[PDB]
Amino acid sequence: KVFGRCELAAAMKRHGLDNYRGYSLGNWVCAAKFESNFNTQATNRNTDGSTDYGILQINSRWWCNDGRTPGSRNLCNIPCSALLSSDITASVNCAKKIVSDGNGMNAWVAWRNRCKGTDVQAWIRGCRL
């Protein structure tokens, strides 16, 4: 499923992400834009044999099990294929764990590079919420 920007912004607000750990909704919509471009099925293979899954590109080495990553931890306690559904609930619940894991939203590289320190409120413009 490819989300519309305000469509995803409402979904994320509904799942408790606005000001979650002090990160406004715009941060989360921006991170999803530059991680997956709002595509729930986005996957990126990394050279270390891990793969990043879903709208927030969560990694198979530590957070979800995809059965092909050596030395994987399955911290969110899910199959990685569950991060690839049109329902964003599994990805949002695992992201809540990752943002509280000691690096805040620095865990997402595309957010550090394209959202950190910017006017992230632009990402919610025109959204009815």
Short mmCIF file of N, CA, C and O in Angstrom, two decimals:
data_model
loop_
_atom_site.label_atom_id
_atom_site.label_comp_id
_atom_site.label_asym_id
_atom_site.label_seq_id
_atom_site.Cartn_x
_atom_site.Cartn_y
_atom_site.Cartn_z
N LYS A 1 0.84 -1.18 0.00
CA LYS A 1 0.00 0.00 0.00
C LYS A 1 0.88 1.25 0.00
O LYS A 1 1.89 1.25 0.72
N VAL A 2 0.58 2.27 -0.79
CA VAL A 2 1.36 3.48 -0.75
C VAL A 2 0.40 4.46 -0.11
O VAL A 2 -0.76 4.65 -0.57
N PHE A 3 0.81 5.01 1.02
CA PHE A 3 0.00 6.01 1.68
C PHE A 3 0.09 7.40 1.05
O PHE A 3 1.12 7.82 0.49
N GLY A 4 -1.04 8.10 1.20
CA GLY A 4 -1.11 9.54 0.95
C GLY A 4 -0.47 10.22 2.19
O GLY A 4 -0.62 9.66 3.29
N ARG A 5 0.21 11.37 2.10
CA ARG A 5 0.90 11.99 3.22
C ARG A 5 0.00 12.27 4.42
O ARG A 5 0.34 11.89 5.54
N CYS A 6 -1.20 12.88 4.27
CA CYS A 6 -2.10 13.14 5.37
C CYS A 6 -2.83 11.89 5.80
O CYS A 6 -3.25 11.76 6.95
N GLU A 7 -2.94 10.93 4.89
CA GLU A 7 -3.50 9.62 5.20
C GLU A 7 -2.60 8.91 6.24
O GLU A 7 -3.06 8.48 7.29
N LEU A 8 -1.31 8.85 5.96
CA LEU A 8 -0.32 8.32 6.90
C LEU A 8 -0.23 9.19 8.10
O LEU A 8 -0.24 8.66 9.21
N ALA A 9 -0.23 10.52 7.99
CA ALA A 9 -0.20 11.34 9.19
C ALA A 9 -1.36 11.01 10.12
O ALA A 9 -1.19 10.90 11.34
N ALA A 10 -2.60 10.80 9.62
CA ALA A 10 -3.71 10.46 10.51
C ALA A 10 -3.54 9.07 11.11
O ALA A 10 -3.80 8.87 12.29
N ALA A 11 -3.02 8.11 10.33
CA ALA A 11 -2.81 6.75 10.80
C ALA A 11 -1.82 6.76 11.99
O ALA A 11 -2.07 6.18 13.06
N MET A 12 -0.71 7.51 11.82
CA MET A 12 0.33 7.60 12.81
C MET A 12 -0.23 8.31 14.02
O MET A 12 0.02 7.86 15.13
N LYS A 13 -0.97 9.42 13.89
CA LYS A 13 -1.54 10.08 15.05
C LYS A 13 -2.45 9.13 15.84
O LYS A 13 -2.37 9.04 17.07
N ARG A 14 -3.28 8.37 15.14
CA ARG A 14 -4.16 7.36 15.72
C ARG A 14 -3.35 6.31 16.48
O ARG A 14 -3.82 5.78 17.49
N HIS A 15 -2.14 5.98 16.03
CA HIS A 15 -1.34 5.00 16.74
C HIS A 15 -0.41 5.60 17.79
O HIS A 15 0.56 4.93 18.17
N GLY A 16 -0.65 6.81 18.27
CA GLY A 16 0.11 7.43 19.37
C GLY A 16 1.49 8.05 19.08
O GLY A 16 2.25 8.36 20.00
N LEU A 17 1.82 8.29 17.81
CA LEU A 17 3.15 8.78 17.51
C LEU A 17 3.32 10.29 17.66
O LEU A 17 4.47 10.71 17.85
N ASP A 18 2.27 11.14 17.65
CA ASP A 18 2.48 12.56 17.83
C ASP A 18 3.03 12.88 19.21
O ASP A 18 2.39 12.64 20.22
N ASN A 19 4.23 13.45 19.24
CA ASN A 19 4.99 13.84 20.41
C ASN A 19 5.37 12.65 21.25
O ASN A 19 5.75 12.81 22.42
N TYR A 20 5.44 11.48 20.60
CA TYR A 20 5.88 10.29 21.28
C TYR A 20 7.37 10.48 21.54
O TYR A 20 8.15 10.68 20.62
N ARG A 21 7.79 10.41 22.81
CA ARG A 21 9.16 10.68 23.25
C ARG A 21 9.59 12.10 22.84
O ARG A 21 10.75 12.44 22.67
N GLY A 22 8.62 13.01 22.73
CA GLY A 22 8.85 14.41 22.37
C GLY A 22 9.11 14.69 20.91
O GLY A 22 9.60 15.77 20.59
N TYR A 23 8.79 13.73 20.03
CA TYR A 23 8.98 13.84 18.58
C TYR A 23 7.65 14.10 17.93
O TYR A 23 6.74 13.28 17.97
N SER A 24 7.47 15.30 17.39
CA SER A 24 6.19 15.66 16.79
C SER A 24 5.89 14.78 15.57
O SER A 24 6.81 14.31 14.87
N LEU A 25 4.60 14.70 15.23
CA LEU A 25 4.10 13.91 14.13
C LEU A 25 4.86 14.14 12.83
O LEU A 25 5.18 13.17 12.14
N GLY A 26 5.22 15.42 12.54
CA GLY A 26 5.95 15.81 11.35
C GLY A 26 7.26 15.08 11.22
O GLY A 26 7.72 14.74 10.14
N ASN A 27 7.94 14.82 12.33
CA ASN A 27 9.19 14.02 12.33
C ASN A 27 8.98 12.61 11.78
O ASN A 27 9.74 12.09 10.98
N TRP A 28 7.88 11.99 12.20
CA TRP A 28 7.50 10.62 11.87
C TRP A 28 7.08 10.54 10.40
O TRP A 28 7.54 9.67 9.64
N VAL A 29 6.26 11.50 9.92
CA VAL A 29 5.87 11.53 8.51
C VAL A 29 7.08 11.79 7.60
O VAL A 29 7.24 11.17 6.54
N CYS A 30 7.97 12.70 8.00
CA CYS A 30 9.19 12.95 7.27
C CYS A 30 10.09 11.71 7.19
O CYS A 30 10.62 11.36 6.11
N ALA A 31 10.27 11.01 8.33
CA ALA A 31 11.09 9.80 8.39
C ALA A 31 10.50 8.77 7.44
O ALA A 31 11.24 8.23 6.65
N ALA A 32 9.20 8.53 7.43
CA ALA A 32 8.57 7.55 6.52
C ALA A 32 8.69 7.98 5.06
O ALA A 32 8.82 7.16 4.15
N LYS A 33 8.63 9.29 4.78
CA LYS A 33 8.80 9.78 3.42
C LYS A 33 10.18 9.42 2.92
O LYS A 33 10.31 8.84 1.84
N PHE A 34 11.21 9.71 3.70
CA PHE A 34 12.54 9.49 3.20
C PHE A 34 12.98 8.07 3.48
O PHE A 34 13.98 7.68 2.89
N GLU A 35 12.33 7.27 4.31
CA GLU A 35 12.74 5.88 4.43
C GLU A 35 12.13 5.00 3.35
O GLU A 35 12.80 4.17 2.74
N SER A 36 10.87 5.15 3.05
CA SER A 36 10.17 4.24 2.17
C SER A 36 9.36 4.88 1.05
O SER A 36 8.73 4.20 0.24
N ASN A 37 9.28 6.20 1.14
CA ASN A 37 8.38 7.03 0.37
C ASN A 37 6.93 6.52 0.46
O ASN A 37 6.14 6.40 -0.50
N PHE A 38 6.56 6.30 1.73
CA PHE A 38 5.23 5.93 2.15
C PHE A 38 4.69 4.60 1.58
O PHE A 38 3.48 4.34 1.62
N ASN A 39 5.60 3.78 1.03
CA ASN A 39 5.30 2.45 0.52
C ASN A 39 5.48 1.39 1.60
O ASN A 39 6.61 1.12 2.01
N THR A 40 4.41 0.71 2.03
CA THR A 40 4.47 -0.32 3.07
C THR A 40 5.31 -1.54 2.70
O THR A 40 5.71 -2.35 3.53
N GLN A 41 5.47 -1.76 1.39
CA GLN A 41 6.18 -2.91 0.91
C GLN A 41 7.62 -2.63 0.60
O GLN A 41 8.30 -3.51 0.10
N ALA A 42 8.15 -1.42 0.83
CA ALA A 42 9.55 -1.16 0.57
C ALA A 42 10.51 -2.09 1.35
O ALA A 42 10.27 -2.40 2.51
N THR A 43 11.52 -2.66 0.69
CA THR A 43 12.54 -3.46 1.37
C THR A 43 13.91 -3.03 0.86
O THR A 43 14.05 -2.64 -0.30
N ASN A 44 14.95 -3.01 1.67
CA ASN A 44 16.25 -2.63 1.19
C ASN A 44 17.20 -3.64 1.77
O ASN A 44 17.14 -3.95 2.95
N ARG A 45 18.00 -4.22 0.90
CA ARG A 45 18.96 -5.22 1.30
C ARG A 45 20.24 -4.51 1.61
O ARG A 45 20.73 -3.67 0.85
N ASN A 46 20.76 -4.83 2.77
CA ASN A 46 22.03 -4.27 3.13
C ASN A 46 23.10 -5.34 2.88
O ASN A 46 22.91 -6.56 2.92
N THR A 47 24.33 -4.89 2.66
CA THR A 47 25.51 -5.71 2.37
C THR A 47 25.94 -6.66 3.49
O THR A 47 26.57 -7.69 3.25
N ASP A 48 25.62 -6.29 4.73
CA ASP A 48 25.89 -7.12 5.89
C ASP A 48 24.88 -8.26 6.00
O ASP A 48 24.81 -8.95 7.01
N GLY A 49 24.03 -8.46 4.98
CA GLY A 49 23.06 -9.53 4.99
C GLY A 49 21.82 -9.29 5.81
O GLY A 49 21.05 -10.23 6.07
N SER A 50 21.66 -8.08 6.30
CA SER A 50 20.39 -7.74 6.90
C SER A 50 19.52 -7.08 5.81
O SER A 50 20.01 -6.71 4.74
N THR A 51 18.22 -6.94 6.04
CA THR A 51 17.30 -6.24 5.17
C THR A 51 16.44 -5.34 6.04
O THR A 51 16.16 -5.67 7.20
N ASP A 52 16.11 -4.19 5.47
CA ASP A 52 15.24 -3.22 6.08
C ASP A 52 13.83 -3.33 5.54
O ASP A 52 13.72 -3.33 4.33
N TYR A 53 12.82 -3.40 6.39
CA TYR A 53 11.44 -3.68 6.03
C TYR A 53 10.36 -2.65 6.30
O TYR A 53 10.22 -2.19 7.45
N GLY A 54 9.54 -2.35 5.29
CA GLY A 54 8.30 -1.63 5.55
C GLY A 54 8.43 -0.12 5.48
O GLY A 54 9.50 0.40 5.15
N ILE A 55 7.35 0.56 5.85
CA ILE A 55 7.31 2.05 5.77
C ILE A 55 8.41 2.76 6.60
O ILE A 55 8.76 3.92 6.33
N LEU A 56 8.86 2.12 7.70
CA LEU A 56 9.91 2.71 8.50
C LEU A 56 11.21 1.94 8.42
O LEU A 56 12.11 2.17 9.22
N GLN A 57 11.36 1.06 7.44
CA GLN A 57 12.61 0.37 7.17
C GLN A 57 13.31 -0.20 8.40
O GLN A 57 14.45 0.16 8.74
N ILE A 58 12.59 -1.06 9.13
CA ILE A 58 13.14 -1.67 10.34
C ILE A 58 14.06 -2.83 9.92
O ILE A 58 13.81 -3.54 8.96
N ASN A 59 15.17 -2.98 10.64
CA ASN A 59 16.22 -3.90 10.27
C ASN A 59 16.10 -5.30 10.85
O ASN A 59 15.85 -5.47 12.05
N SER A 60 16.35 -6.31 10.02
CA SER A 60 16.28 -7.73 10.38
C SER A 60 17.38 -8.25 11.32
O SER A 60 17.23 -9.29 11.93
N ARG A 61 18.50 -7.55 11.44
CA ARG A 61 19.49 -8.02 12.37
C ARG A 61 19.05 -7.87 13.80
O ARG A 61 19.35 -8.73 14.61
N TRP A 62 18.32 -6.86 14.21
CA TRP A 62 18.02 -6.75 15.62
C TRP A 62 16.54 -6.82 15.93
O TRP A 62 16.17 -7.28 17.01
N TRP A 63 15.65 -6.43 14.98
CA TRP A 63 14.29 -6.17 15.40
C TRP A 63 13.20 -7.13 14.97
O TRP A 63 12.21 -7.29 15.70
N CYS A 64 13.34 -7.76 13.83
CA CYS A 64 12.34 -8.68 13.33
C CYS A 64 13.08 -9.85 12.75
O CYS A 64 14.23 -9.76 12.34
N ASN A 65 12.43 -10.99 12.73
CA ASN A 65 12.98 -12.19 12.15
C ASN A 65 12.57 -12.41 10.71
O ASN A 65 11.36 -12.50 10.40
N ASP A 66 13.54 -12.55 9.81
CA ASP A 66 13.27 -12.88 8.41
C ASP A 66 13.94 -14.20 8.01
O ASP A 66 14.12 -14.49 6.84
N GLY A 67 14.50 -14.90 9.02
CA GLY A 67 15.15 -16.19 8.83
C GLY A 67 16.44 -16.19 7.99
O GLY A 67 17.08 -17.24 7.84
N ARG A 68 16.92 -15.09 7.44
CA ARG A 68 18.14 -15.12 6.66
C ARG A 68 19.20 -14.16 7.14
O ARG A 68 20.12 -13.86 6.39
N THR A 69 19.13 -13.67 8.38
CA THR A 69 20.14 -12.72 8.79
C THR A 69 20.95 -13.43 9.84
O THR A 69 20.37 -13.92 10.80
N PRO A 70 22.26 -13.59 9.68
CA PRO A 70 23.10 -14.19 10.70
C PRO A 70 23.22 -13.35 11.96
O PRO A 70 23.35 -12.12 11.87
N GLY A 71 23.13 -14.04 13.09
CA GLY A 71 23.19 -13.42 14.39
C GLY A 71 22.06 -12.46 14.71
O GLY A 71 22.26 -11.47 15.45
N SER A 72 20.86 -12.74 14.18
CA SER A 72 19.73 -11.88 14.42
C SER A 72 19.15 -12.09 15.81
O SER A 72 19.24 -13.17 16.41
N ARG A 73 18.75 -10.96 16.37
CA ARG A 73 17.97 -10.84 17.60
C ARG A 73 16.56 -10.54 17.10
O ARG A 73 16.32 -10.00 16.00
N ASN A 74 15.54 -10.92 17.82
CA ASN A 74 14.25 -10.58 17.25
C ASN A 74 13.58 -9.77 18.30
O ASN A 74 12.59 -10.18 18.90
N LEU A 75 14.12 -8.58 18.52
CA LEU A 75 13.65 -7.79 19.63
C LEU A 75 12.21 -7.35 19.67
O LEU A 75 11.58 -7.33 20.72
N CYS A 76 11.62 -7.05 18.51
CA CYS A 76 10.22 -6.68 18.46
C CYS A 76 9.33 -7.90 18.49
O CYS A 76 8.13 -7.76 18.61
N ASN A 77 9.92 -9.11 18.35
CA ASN A 77 9.25 -10.39 18.42
C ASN A 77 8.17 -10.64 17.39
O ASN A 77 7.04 -11.08 17.63
N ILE A 78 8.58 -10.32 16.17
CA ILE A 78 7.75 -10.45 14.99
C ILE A 78 8.52 -11.00 13.79
O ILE A 78 9.73 -10.75 13.64
N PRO A 79 7.82 -11.66 12.85
CA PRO A 79 8.36 -11.85 11.52
C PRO A 79 8.46 -10.52 10.79
O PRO A 79 7.61 -9.66 10.89
N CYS A 80 9.52 -10.35 10.06
CA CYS A 80 9.71 -9.15 9.29
C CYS A 80 8.65 -9.00 8.21
O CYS A 80 8.34 -7.90 7.78
N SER A 81 8.04 -10.09 7.73
CA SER A 81 7.00 -10.00 6.71
C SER A 81 5.79 -9.30 7.30
O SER A 81 5.11 -8.64 6.54
N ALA A 82 5.52 -9.33 8.62
CA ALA A 82 4.46 -8.56 9.25
C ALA A 82 4.68 -7.01 9.13
O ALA A 82 3.73 -6.22 9.23
N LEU A 83 5.91 -6.54 8.87
CA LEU A 83 6.19 -5.12 8.70
C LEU A 83 5.86 -4.75 7.29
O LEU A 83 5.91 -3.56 6.93
N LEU A 84 5.51 -5.72 6.45
CA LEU A 84 5.26 -5.40 5.07
C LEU A 84 3.75 -5.35 4.78
O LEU A 84 3.35 -5.37 3.61
N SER A 85 2.88 -5.23 5.78
CA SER A 85 1.45 -5.18 5.52
C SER A 85 0.93 -3.75 5.34
O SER A 85 1.60 -2.77 5.66
N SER A 86 -0.28 -3.61 4.79
CA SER A 86 -0.95 -2.33 4.59
C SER A 86 -1.38 -1.72 5.94
O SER A 86 -1.59 -0.53 6.09
N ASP A 87 -1.53 -2.54 6.98
CA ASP A 87 -1.87 -2.14 8.34
C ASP A 87 -0.52 -1.72 9.03
O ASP A 87 0.36 -2.57 9.24
N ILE A 88 -0.36 -0.44 9.46
CA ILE A 88 0.94 -0.02 10.01
C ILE A 88 1.18 -0.32 11.49
O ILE A 88 2.26 -0.08 11.99
N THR A 89 0.17 -0.86 12.18
CA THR A 89 0.25 -1.27 13.59
C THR A 89 1.52 -2.01 13.98
O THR A 89 2.12 -1.48 14.92
N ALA A 90 1.96 -3.10 13.31
CA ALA A 90 3.19 -3.79 13.70
C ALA A 90 4.43 -2.89 13.58
O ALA A 90 5.22 -2.79 14.54
N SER A 91 4.60 -2.17 12.46
CA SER A 91 5.69 -1.20 12.31
C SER A 91 5.72 -0.05 13.35
O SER A 91 6.81 0.30 13.85
N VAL A 92 4.58 0.52 13.73
CA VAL A 92 4.49 1.57 14.72
C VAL A 92 4.87 1.02 16.10
O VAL A 92 5.62 1.66 16.84
N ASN A 93 4.41 -0.17 16.48
CA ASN A 93 4.74 -0.77 17.78
C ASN A 93 6.21 -1.14 17.89
O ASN A 93 6.82 -0.91 18.93
N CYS A 94 6.81 -1.62 16.83
CA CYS A 94 8.23 -1.86 16.87
C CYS A 94 8.98 -0.51 16.86
O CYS A 94 9.92 -0.35 17.63
N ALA A 95 8.58 0.52 16.10
CA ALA A 95 9.26 1.81 16.06
C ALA A 95 9.30 2.50 17.42
O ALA A 95 10.33 3.08 17.79
N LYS A 96 8.23 2.36 18.22
CA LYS A 96 8.13 2.80 19.60
C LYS A 96 9.25 2.22 20.46
O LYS A 96 9.83 2.92 21.30
N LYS A 97 9.61 0.96 20.23
CA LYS A 97 10.74 0.32 20.90
C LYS A 97 12.08 0.85 20.46
O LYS A 97 12.98 1.10 21.25
N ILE A 98 12.24 0.97 19.15
CA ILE A 98 13.47 1.44 18.59
C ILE A 98 13.72 2.91 18.99
O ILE A 98 14.85 3.20 19.40
N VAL A 99 12.77 3.85 18.97
CA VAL A 99 13.05 5.23 19.29
C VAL A 99 13.44 5.35 20.76
O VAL A 99 14.23 6.23 21.10
N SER A 100 12.99 4.45 21.66
CA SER A 100 13.37 4.47 23.07
C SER A 100 14.66 3.65 23.35
O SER A 100 15.02 3.40 24.49
N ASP A 101 15.45 3.25 22.34
CA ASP A 101 16.60 2.39 22.54
C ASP A 101 17.95 3.10 22.63
O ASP A 101 19.02 2.56 22.38
N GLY A 102 17.87 4.38 22.96
CA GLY A 102 19.04 5.18 23.33
C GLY A 102 19.64 6.10 22.29
O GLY A 102 20.73 6.66 22.49
N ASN A 103 18.96 6.29 21.16
CA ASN A 103 19.50 7.15 20.13
C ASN A 103 18.37 8.01 19.62
O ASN A 103 18.56 8.71 18.62
N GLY A 104 17.19 7.99 20.26
CA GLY A 104 16.01 8.69 19.77
C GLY A 104 15.76 8.41 18.29
O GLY A 104 15.98 7.28 17.85
N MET A 105 15.34 9.40 17.48
CA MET A 105 15.10 9.09 16.08
C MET A 105 16.32 9.05 15.21
O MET A 105 16.25 8.75 14.01
N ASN A 106 17.49 9.23 15.85
CA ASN A 106 18.73 8.98 15.14
C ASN A 106 18.85 7.56 14.64
O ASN A 106 19.67 7.30 13.78
N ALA A 107 18.03 6.62 15.10
CA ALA A 107 17.97 5.24 14.59
C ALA A 107 17.64 5.12 13.08
O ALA A 107 18.03 4.22 12.32
N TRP A 108 16.87 6.09 12.58
CA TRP A 108 16.59 6.12 11.17
C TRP A 108 17.56 7.06 10.46
O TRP A 108 17.52 8.29 10.65
N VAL A 109 18.39 6.54 9.58
CA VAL A 109 19.40 7.36 8.90
C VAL A 109 18.80 8.46 8.02
O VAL A 109 19.21 9.62 8.07
N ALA A 110 17.76 8.15 7.25
CA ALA A 110 17.07 9.13 6.39
C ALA A 110 16.44 10.23 7.25
O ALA A 110 16.39 11.36 6.82
N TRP A 111 15.96 10.01 8.48
CA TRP A 111 15.47 11.07 9.32
C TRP A 111 16.67 11.91 9.73
O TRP A 111 16.55 13.14 9.62
N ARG A 112 17.80 11.34 10.20
CA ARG A 112 18.93 12.16 10.66
C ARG A 112 19.35 13.08 9.51
O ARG A 112 19.48 14.29 9.66
N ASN A 113 19.45 12.54 8.32
CA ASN A 113 19.90 13.31 7.18
C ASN A 113 18.95 14.23 6.47
O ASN A 113 19.41 15.20 5.87
N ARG A 114 17.65 13.93 6.43
CA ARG A 114 16.68 14.76 5.73
C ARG A 114 15.62 15.40 6.59
O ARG A 114 14.82 16.18 6.05
N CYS A 115 15.56 15.13 7.89
CA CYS A 115 14.52 15.69 8.73
C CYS A 115 15.04 16.40 9.97
O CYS A 115 14.49 17.40 10.42
N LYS A 116 16.08 15.86 10.60
CA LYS A 116 16.65 16.44 11.81
C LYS A 116 17.05 17.90 11.57
O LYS A 116 17.70 18.26 10.59
N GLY A 117 16.55 18.70 12.47
CA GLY A 117 16.81 20.14 12.43
C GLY A 117 16.01 20.94 11.38
O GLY A 117 16.24 22.14 11.27
N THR A 118 15.14 20.31 10.57
CA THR A 118 14.38 21.05 9.58
C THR A 118 13.02 21.47 10.07
O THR A 118 12.58 21.20 11.17
N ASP A 119 12.32 22.19 9.24
CA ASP A 119 10.97 22.62 9.55
C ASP A 119 10.07 21.40 9.29
O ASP A 119 9.49 21.26 8.21
N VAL A 120 9.95 20.49 10.26
CA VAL A 120 9.20 19.27 10.03
C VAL A 120 7.69 19.41 10.05
O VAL A 120 6.94 18.53 9.58
N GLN A 121 7.23 20.55 10.60
CA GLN A 121 5.81 20.89 10.58
C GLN A 121 5.27 20.99 9.16
O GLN A 121 4.10 20.71 8.97
N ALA A 122 6.05 21.30 8.12
CA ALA A 122 5.60 21.31 6.75
C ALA A 122 5.01 19.99 6.33
O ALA A 122 4.13 19.92 5.48
N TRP A 123 5.44 18.89 6.95
CA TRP A 123 4.97 17.59 6.56
C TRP A 123 3.52 17.26 6.90
O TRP A 123 3.00 16.26 6.43
N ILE A 124 2.87 18.04 7.73
CA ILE A 124 1.50 17.92 8.24
C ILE A 124 0.62 19.00 7.58
O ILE A 124 -0.53 19.24 7.96
N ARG A 125 1.16 19.76 6.64
CA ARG A 125 0.40 20.87 6.13
C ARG A 125 -0.73 20.33 5.28
O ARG A 125 -0.59 19.36 4.55
N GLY A 126 -1.90 20.91 5.53
CA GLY A 126 -3.08 20.55 4.76
C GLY A 126 -3.74 19.34 5.36
O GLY A 126 -4.76 18.89 4.84
N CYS A 127 -3.21 18.79 6.45
CA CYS A 127 -3.82 17.62 7.02
C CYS A 127 -4.89 18.06 7.96
O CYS A 127 -4.75 19.06 8.66
N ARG A 128 -6.01 17.34 7.91
CA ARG A 128 -7.11 17.61 8.83
C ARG A 128 -6.96 16.70 10.03
O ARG A 128 -7.15 15.49 9.90
N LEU A 129 -6.50 17.26 11.14
CA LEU A 129 -6.31 16.57 12.40
C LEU A 129 -6.03 17.71 13.38
O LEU A 129 -5.30 18.66 13.04
#
